[PDB]
């Protein structure tokens, strides 16, 4: 349960959804979009030491072998498990549609 | 194509798959496998720039967003793509038993 909700209810040194906005023109440089302005997309951050959201084996092992070897580059990284839709307004011409963008919001993230 | 292949061919600065060995004594403290001692895993390790294999909306997004800000924290992490498993020999009693442990090699990295 490595999500907003959890993880923006407290600090945590581990791996984490943080906090994150992006604005389309000045960020991404898209001058297409009419509503929203930006939004906020989120992102994950932080160690993964075992126990902590390990879901594939390899990441066991790997965070395992960390363990037993401090400075070691290799871990598993934190990364996001559940993407979420943005909804979005641009025009075409004059005609305003409604898409909905897939996978634009991390809602939780995982140890990889 | 982030694979050992490409990935050992050369040097490389990007994402990318890197060497390990793991040793089931030594490194996990395993004193139940009999056959290997130990075996190849390899991790991923390296920067996730844009183009460079970024496979979900929100990897391209993050990666975008990093270019508009390059020191910026938000990016997208180097994690394995494909796993590929490992046979192993352990003793039951003394009845010697064949398994395939799933998941144990990584063959691949991208960028999430």
């Excluded at 943080?18 to 604005?23: A, F, G, P």
């Excluded at 993407?83 to 996978?103: A, D, H, M, T, W």
Aim: hydrophobic share 30%.
């Amino acid at each position: 349960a490595l999500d907003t909700n959890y993880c923006f209810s407290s600090t945590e040194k581990n791996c984490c959804v943080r906090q994150l906005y992006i604005d389309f023109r000045k960020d991404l440089g898209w001058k297409w979009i009419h509503e929203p302005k930006g939004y906020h997309a989120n992102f994950c951050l932080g160690p993964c030491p075992y126990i902590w959201s390990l879901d594939t084996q390899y990441s066991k092992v790997l965070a395992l072998y960390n363990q037993h070897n401090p400075g070691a580059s290799a871990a598993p990284c934190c990364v996001p498990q559940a993407l979420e839709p943005l909804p979005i307004v641009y025009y075409v011409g004059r005609k305003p549609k409604v898409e909905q963008l897939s996978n634009m919001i991390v809602r939780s993230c995982k140890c990889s």
